[PDB]
């Protein structure tokens, strides 16, 4: 299940958490890398209803929807394969337990810092049982220049 090409030039992600600065940094990276399509499909923040956040692609503006429940985010958007999880250290474990059992997700990225060791042990166990690739705790993420950037890897533009 642990594939080789994690991120490519045709990847699209689902962000978990109201992280408009990080998503706009990712969209600026994907504009700078001469990439045709943005690498974010939708965002998840469960504390308000669905809407469309407005983000900046190059010189122009586009819209990225924000959902409340993860089930609608997986149903409406099946082309994604990577879920970035900006949840806190106390709400990332349940978020990953909910998010691993979905179909289209091929890799998750737990950017939180301060997870319990028993919780990340159960998380690693379910991750190797399912076959997803986990880039988890206490990270800033990864960056594949020319293709993809996870969160705020590297810093500003």
């Amino acid at each position: 299940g642990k594939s080789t090409t994690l991120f490519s030039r045709h990847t699209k992600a689902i962000v978990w958490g109201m992280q408009t600065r990080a998503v706009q940094g990712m969209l600026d990276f994907d504009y700078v890398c001469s990439r045709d399509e943005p690498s974010v499909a939708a965002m998840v923040y469960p504390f308000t209803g669905d809407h469309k956040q407005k983000f900046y692609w190059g010189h122009k503006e586009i819209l990225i929807p924000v959902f409340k429940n993860m089930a609608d985010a997986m149903r409406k958007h099946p082309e994604v394969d990577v879920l970035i999880n900006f949840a806190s250290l106390r709400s990332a474990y349940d978020s990953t337990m909910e998010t691993m059992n979905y179909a289209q997700i091929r890799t998750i990225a737990i950017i939180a810092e301060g997870i319990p060791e028993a919780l990340t042990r159960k998380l690693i166990k379910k991750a190797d049982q399912k076959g997803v690739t986990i880039i988890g705790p206490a990270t800033v993420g990864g960056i594949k220049p020319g293709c993809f950037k996870i969160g705020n890897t590297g810093g500003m533009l």
């Binding site: 407005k54 900046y56 010189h59 503006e61």
Partner: protein, 273 residues
């Protein structure tokens, strides 16, 4: 200079998908104003444009004009026209008198337009009989919105309900929710003659029919425009003509300040607080 030079990039709020004003022509929803006047769409047509952003058919634009002609003034007794007359007699101006009349269009006066659509379409998609919908609504102790009227009855009917019915029977294809509402009306007038299907219920169910049985609204648009409140706007924009008429009339009769005599009050104060 940096924006016109094009090297700054600022995030604009206020998305507003209606009425692009800049440029060589005042574009409405998507249609320029010369095309609006050339296609002869009336104030119902520009209501369809500005509110729904869908160019409506001609039997629906005329129905919107019929709604704004029927939901005009209904006398000065009712509470909104009463507040407009009180403020115009205290000599203010048009926007404050019309506005202090418009801040009574709530739930008991004139804001049944949306609840008599939400209720009648929530009891039609979970399909019950009218005789059980009335039983449920009395059992819960809540008022069937858009079924009651203070002064009109079946022995004293309001004619503006009949003018809309004789239009929505002919030019409207496939209007079942109106038939459902008429069934509930006669079920309730069999018991009490006071409870007559209002214009504030007939316009609600006829607008749900006009949205979901004519074109250009699928099922999420035509329920979003009920949940958002696009049917209260029909009453507010229709009754603005009556409230401005009452301001102009009380300004032309040169009436004085209103005082509301103490023989109509009965102060019921505590003893010694």
């Amino acid at each position: 200079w940096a924006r016109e030079l094009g090297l700054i990039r600022k995030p604009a709020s206020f998305m507003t998908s209606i009425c692009d004003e800049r440029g060589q022509e005042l574009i409405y929803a998507g249609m320029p104003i010369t095309e609006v006047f050339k296609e002869e769409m009336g104030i119902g047509g520009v209501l369809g444009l500005l509110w729904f952003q869908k160019r409506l058919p001609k039997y629906s634009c005329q129905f919107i004009e019929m709604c704004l002609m029927v939901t005009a003034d209904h006398g000065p007794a009712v509470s909104g026209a009463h507040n407009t007359i009180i403020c115009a007699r205290a000599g203010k101006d048009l926007v404050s008198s019309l506005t202090s009349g418009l801040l009574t269009i709530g739930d008991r006066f004139g804001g049944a337009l949306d609840a008599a659509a939400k209720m009648f379409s929530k009891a039609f998609d979970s399909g019950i009989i009218p005789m059980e919908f009335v039983n449920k609504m009395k059992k819960e102790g809540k008022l069937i919105m858009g079924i009651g009227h203070r002064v009109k009855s079946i022995n004293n009917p309001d004619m503006r309900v009949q003018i809309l019915k004789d239009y929505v029977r002919q030019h409207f294809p496939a209007t079942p929710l109106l038939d459902y509402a008429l069934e509930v009306e006669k079920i309730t007038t069999s018991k009490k003659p006071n409870l007559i299907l209002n214009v504030d219920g007939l316009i609600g169910v006829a607008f749900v029919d006009m949205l979901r049985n004519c074109g250009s609204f699928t099922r999420e648009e035509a329920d979003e425009y009920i949940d958002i409140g696009a049917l209260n706007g029909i009453f507010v924009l229709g009754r603005s003509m009556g409230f401005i008429g009452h301001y102009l009339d009380q300004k032309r009769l040169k009436q004085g300040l209103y005082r509301h005599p103490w023989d109509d009050i009965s102060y019921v104060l505590p003893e010694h607080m």
